[PDB]
Structures are given as C-alpha cells and as structure tokens.
Amino acid sequence: EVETFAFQAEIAQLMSLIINTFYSNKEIFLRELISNSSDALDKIRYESLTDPSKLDSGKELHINLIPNKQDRTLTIVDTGIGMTKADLINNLGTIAKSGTKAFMEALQAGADISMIGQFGVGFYSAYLVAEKVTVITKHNDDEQYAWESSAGGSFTVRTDTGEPMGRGTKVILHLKEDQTEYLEERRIKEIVKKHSQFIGYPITLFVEK
C-alpha cells in the first residue's frame, strides 16, 4: 500500500533550484543532515527530562554515518524524536513553505545555497548529491513509515516492513553517479571535522569490508 503525494509548488521549486543550479560546494549536505539529527536528538532529550519513559524506545542518543559502496548509498541514522506520518507528509516536520520563501529572497539579496539551513529547509540539500532519498522514521506516538522521492514533483509514503528501528530517523541517500566521493572514509571524516566538530552527540563513521 503506497500513497503518492504532490509536493507543494514552492517545495518543488526549491528542489529543482537545488538540483539545477550550478554550485560546487556540495559537501554542505552532510552538515545540514547532521544538524537536523542533532535537533531531533535535542527534542527527545528535552521530553525525557520530565518523562523518562520517552526513552523506553531506546536510551542511546547518537548519530551513525554508514557508507555502502555496493548500493552506492550514504545513510545518516539518528535516535532522535522521529517523525509521525503527518510530519512526513507535512514536509518532514519543517515549515518548508515559509522557509523556502525566506530562503529565496535571501538568495536574490546576496546569499548562497550553503545558508539553506538557516531557513529550516536544510533537509532538501540532500538533493545536491542524491538522485533519490529514502527517509525511514519512527516516533513514539506512531508506527514506522518510509518516505521516498526522486524529486520530479512527487513523493511516496508507506508503512515500512523493514528492520524495526525503535525510535529515530534514517536518511538514505542514493548518490548520483558522479558523487561517490562522499562514500570514501577520508572524505566523510574531513567534512565532519570541518563542519560538525562541535555537535554534542557521538558521530560514528562506519567502515566497509
């Protein structure tokens, strides 16, 4: 059972801007996704401060980076608060309509794409490097769901029958053919140290056989 949705016109416009604009500093996608994971971890920590049972779905608060050269995927896993089905449909929990509006005025007033995270729509920078993005997520108040889009104006949502997560979000980046540098260990390490050296959660870079 797969439901297909249309992006709001402004989000579709943001995505094709990210896809079609010439912009060489593509590595900022990883900074934005790690920063999104840090925000989600902050939220479940804050809720656990007054209600410890919110961590019954998992006590560890961390971020894992898993490259896979065979599948040509880079996966960012976090054990944050996760997303409900309604959040996934509502632009993955963001205020993307007003965020895109403020982002695109800032661009024509002298900003560049790397500032996308300041407008709340940093997730869509994933399409700087990925032809297709899959988001697996589990929130305490909902079941596990899978969001997917290759851009082109539409996305899908389905109940995920895959590996149970417990709680959190998994962003799977199916990388473009000319962007496999972001699967190499030393390149990921360089980006993490450059842009995310102060994130307050352990970032584990997985290695391959």
Ligand SMILES: OCc1cccc(Oc2ccccn2)c1
């Ligand atoms: O070292 C460089 C660097 C630049 C900017 C942020 C850095 O770490 C953090 C800290 C808190 C939240 C997110 N990222 C690190």
